Amino acid sequence: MLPAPKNLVVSEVTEDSLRLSWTAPDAAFDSFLIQYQESEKVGEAINLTVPGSERSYDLTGLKPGTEYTVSIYGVLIPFPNLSNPLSAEFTTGGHHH
Amino acid sequence: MLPAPKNLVVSEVTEDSLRLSWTAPDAAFDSFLIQYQESEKVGEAINLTVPGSERSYDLTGLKPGTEYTVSIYGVLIPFPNLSNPLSAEFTTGGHHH
Numbered sequence: 745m746l747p748a749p750k751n752l753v754v755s756e757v758t759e760d761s762l763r764l765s766w767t768a769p770d771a772a773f774d775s776f777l778i779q780y781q782e783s784e785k786v787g788e789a790i791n792l793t794v795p796g797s798e799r800s801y802d803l804t805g806l807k808p809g810t811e812y813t814v815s816i817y818g819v820l821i822p823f824p825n826l827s828n829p830l831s832a833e834f835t836t837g838g839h840h841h
Numbered sequence: 842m843l844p845a846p847k848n849l850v851v852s853e854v855t856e857d858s859l860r861l862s863w864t865a866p867d868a869a870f871d872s873f874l875i876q877y878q879e880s881e882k883v884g885e886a887i888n889l890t891v892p893g894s895e896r897s898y899d900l901t902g903l904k905p906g907t908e909y910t911v912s913i914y915g916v917l918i919p920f921p922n923l924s925n926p927l928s929a930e931f932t933t934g935g936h937h938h
Contacts, residue, residue, distance in 0.1 A: 746924040759935040766927070777923065783930055808935030818924035826874065827843040827915035830863070833880055838856040838905030 747771050749816050759808040765800040766816055772796060773818035783811040793819070844868050846913050856905040862897040863913055869893060870915035880908040890916070 747769035756763035773796035779789040780803060794801050844866035853860035870893035876886040877900060891898050
């Protein structure tokens with residue numbers, strides 16, 4: 745289990761936008777996943793992804809006087825799993841020039 | 842350790858091309874990595890990736906009467922690792938209309 749980001753805060757609160765900020769734990773991430781949605785309306789979260797270098801993000805296109813539930817996760821993208829190799833030597837037709 | 846693909850074979854041998862074929866083990870892959878290079882020339886492998894649905898691939902742009910070392914690996918792309926979420930409820934300015 746990777747440690748969660750810490751201290752999710754808001755600033756630059758307007759009628760249609762919110763600046764999110766957070767702090768990195770003792771592990772670096774490739775990305776942060778930010779999920780958000782109106783706390784009351786029935787429906788699905790909107791998913792945003794930002795590079796792991798980032799510590800703030802501006803949410804935009806929001807509604808005035810409205811509560812939003814915001815969740816942030818650290819994301820680590822593992823290297824792919826490789827099998828053992830299978831090898832052969834194959835030779836094209838004709839003669840080498 | 843994922844099991845290797847099996848039975849790497851060649852067909853449609855021409856002066857400039859080789860059809861590779863192989864068999865899947867008792868595990869499915871997202872992709873196969875195919876590395877190939879002239880067996881004798883000093884230099885780097887060429888890396889090709891094909892979807893895990895595939896069981897043959899045509900190597901092209903080759904030299905006549907030339908031996909190529911070919912290696913194939915199964916590739917599995919894991920789901921990303923997620924931290925625990927950190928959540929908050931934030932509220933935009935103004936009044937709801």
